[PDB]
Amino acid sequence: STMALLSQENTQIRDLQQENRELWISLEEHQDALELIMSKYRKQMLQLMVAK
Amino acid sequence: LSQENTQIRDLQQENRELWISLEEHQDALELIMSKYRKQMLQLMVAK
Amino acid sequence: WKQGRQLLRQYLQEVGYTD
Structure with a gap:
């Protein structure tokens, strides 16, 4: 391919x-x-075990 | 087929x-x- | 690789889920 980034294979890879x-x-x-x-x-678990 | 096809499959x-x-x-x-x-609900019940 | 499952399982067990 000569189309560079926009060749069908390269756009599939890029996507x-x-x-x-x-x-x-x-x-x-x-x-x-x-x-x-x-x-x-x-x-919150410390507060819970502290109150309850 | 080619290595671009291998890279796509990978x-x-x-x-x-x-x-x-x-x-x-x-x-x-x-x-x-x-x-x-x-747990927040239970902290609300306890407090 | 996908060893991130052990961390998720540690968290899930810490908040009280079980195997």
């Missing part, structure tokens, strides 16, 4: 790389959210 | 794997948020 990147970013966002919620869960 | 397999992992992370986050909410 898959872009979607895989979005999935990897969402995974990182989910792990960030999980460790933040777990931090709050543990704090 | 990327599609990785895509399927990533969607599966994201499903597991979304499910775990939903389960943990549910427990966190219910």
Whole structure:
């Protein structure tokens, strides 16, 4: 192919790389959210065991 | 056939794997948020 | 690879889910 980035094979590759990147970013966002919620869960558990 | 076809097939397999992992992370986050909410309810009952 | 499942399971067990 001479079309460079816009060749049919290269756009298929590029689209898959872009979607895989979005999935990897969402995974990182989910792990960030999980460790933040777990931090709050543990704090609230101390307050719970303190009151009850 | 060619190596571009091999790279496409590898990327599609990785895509399927990533969607599966994201499903597991979304499910775990939903389960943990549910427990966190219910713990807040119990902290409301105790306080 | 997908060893991130063990971390998720640690979290889930910490908040009281079981196997």
